[PDB]
């Protein structure tokens, strides 16, 4: 008759006694048990058999599922009225659509070129709460891309659902990005610039761009506004009149190295604006990714101050830190693998979370960057987006996150 040493739970199935000769072996067993026990509330994986399904999984997770909470710990939107749609094989068209999805309070979904997928058509019906009993009114689908990315047939089918459709597209990467940016607007007097080949650079900054700031730069996910991203040629000397008239006199941060955006283009934007342009650069995808994290998610930034207030409302500015994290592929082997980070961007803006780009390995800059921005007191969260990220990477990020 063992008189065990504590009060148990009404539904305790077993009274476990963990024993060992070595205090170390017992220490690690219970430590690993604590981590593996919390992994079910710490880690999430939003992935599917392909890009189209993965984006649906993100829409199912954060839009019209469980409702909105004041801690910003649940949904980005519960009463969804808009959807952003992108071509699954047209990443370059929808590259800067994440801040649009943010401003429109919309999930970002992916479709095939020629004909809308039944999977996606069902999702749109779900997230928008479309039923044959009520008139479909006030519901809009913004297509980011041209007719070669998302066909005309997709639109006519979307219209047979009673949905309003708005296309944003131009003759190339750069005109399309400008059309999307023009929808978002410069309510924060700022814009982020990336190069036509800096696909991994736009995916790193999407998080920051989709963060809704107020007039003083505080984080207001209720009455705030996101910041647009514009794509530029790079390796070029002038900006077009459209970009000039758009930018006006707004602050600009160029994300990426000089192979993505030349010094010539930097000075061109500087002259048209009449202001100094900031540059967050690196030598590779992961180096620019780390620099973005270190810069925009540092302790003294407003994102860090707001992110801790979501963990504990009575927390000081000295408690500032990053607590939610996303991880997706970097597209070194295949560049279209970046499309898994496009769908999450707006969500990372709401959740105040950076997106770490790594498939096979986590760089040393990324490791140091995460350790420098991660929070200290409260719990951490990591969501993996897509299939194919190495366990090396996940365990490394978990170690850095105290997980």
């Amino acid at each position: 008759t063992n008189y065990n040493e504590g009060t148990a739970y009404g539904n305790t199935p077993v009274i476990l006694t963990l024993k060992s000769t070595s205090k170390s072996n017992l220490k690690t067993a219970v430590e690993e048990l604590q981590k593996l026990n919390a992994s079910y509330s710490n880690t999430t994986t939003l992935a599917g058999d392909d890009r189209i399904q993965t984006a649906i999984e993100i829409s199912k997770e954060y839009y019209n599922n469980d409702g909105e909470k004041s801690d910003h710990s649940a949904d980005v939107k519960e009463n969804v009225k808009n959807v952003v749609l992108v071509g699954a094989n047209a990443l370059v068209d929808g590259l800067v659509a994440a801040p649009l999805a943010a401003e429109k309070d919309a999930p970002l979904l992916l479709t095939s070129k020629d004909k809308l997928d039944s999977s996606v058509k069902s999702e749109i019906k779900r997230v928008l709460d479309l039923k044959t009993s009520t008139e479909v009114t006030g519901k809009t689908v913004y297509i980011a891309g041209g007719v070669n990315s998302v066909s005309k047939e997709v639109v006519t089918e979307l219209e047979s659902m009673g949905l309003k459709v708005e296309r944003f597209s131009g003759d190339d990467r750069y005109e399309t990005s400008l059309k999307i940016a023009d929808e978002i607007g410069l309510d924060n007097d700022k814009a982020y610039v990336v190069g036509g080949t800096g696909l991994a650079d736009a995916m790193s900054i999407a998080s920051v761009a989709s963060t809704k700031l107020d007039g003083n730069g505080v984080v207001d996910r209720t009455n705030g506004h996101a910041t647009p991203i514009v794509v530029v040629d790079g390796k070029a000397d002038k900006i077009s009149d459209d970009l000039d008239s758009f930018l006006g006199s707004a602050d600009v941060d160029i994300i990426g190295g000089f192979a993505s955006v030349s010094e010539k283009m930097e000075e061109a934007i500087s002259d048209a604006t009449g202001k100094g342009v900031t540059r967050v650069k690196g030598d590779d995808r992961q180096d620019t990714n780390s620099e973005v994290i270190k810069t925009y998610y540092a302790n003294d930034t407003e994102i860090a101050k707001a992110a801790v207030l979501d963990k504990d409302s009575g927390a000081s500015s000295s408690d500032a830190g990053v607590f939610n994290f996303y991880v997706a592929k970097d597209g070194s082997t295949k560049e279209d693998q970046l499309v898994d980070a496009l769908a999450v961007g707006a969500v990372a803006g709401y959740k105040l979370a950076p997106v770490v780009l790594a498939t096979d390995s986590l760089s040393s800059d990324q490791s140091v960057a995460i350790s420098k921005v991660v929070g200290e007191k409260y719990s951490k969260d990591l969501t993996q987006v897509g299939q194919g990220i190495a366990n090396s990477v996940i365990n490394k990020i978990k170690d850095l996150l105290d997980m």
Binding site: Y3, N4, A8, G10, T12, P13, T17, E31, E32, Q34
Partner: protein, 174 residues
Amino acid sequence: AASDVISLQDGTNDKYTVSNTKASDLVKDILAAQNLTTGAVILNKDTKVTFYDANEKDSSTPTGDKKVYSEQTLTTANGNEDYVKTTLKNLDAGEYAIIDLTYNNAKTVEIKVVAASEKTVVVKNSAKDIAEKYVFEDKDLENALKTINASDFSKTDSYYQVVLYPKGKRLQGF
């Protein structure tokens, strides 16, 4: 033996859990300890056994769960040795009991009888199968580490040991 119930108040701890599979001896020991005629410390003859069901709630009760069956004062005089023994042994999932002990020392101890088996794992990767099947509260696992990470922490019969109580079983297959 009655020694086992008297030992419960020898330290500052006063919260324990016994498996319902030991209900016969448990009751034996409690009655034996309250029938002690000569020990320095004797259990009073006021041992109270309250029963609860965890799956239905009542915030007015001390545990927060709705009481079930009848509240018993277990003594040899009251002749309720067989009701309590058989009720404890035939507890169904989610039903439990709180046995409140008072001593001539004016000390109190609480024993909780849960419908749980006792299992001992000897260690690692061992934790994987434990966490796949069962769900724990972190504060419990933390406190476990807080005792393992103390200077006072000693070996039990050539073995370091900690006792963990899962909240329930985890959903598998997902």
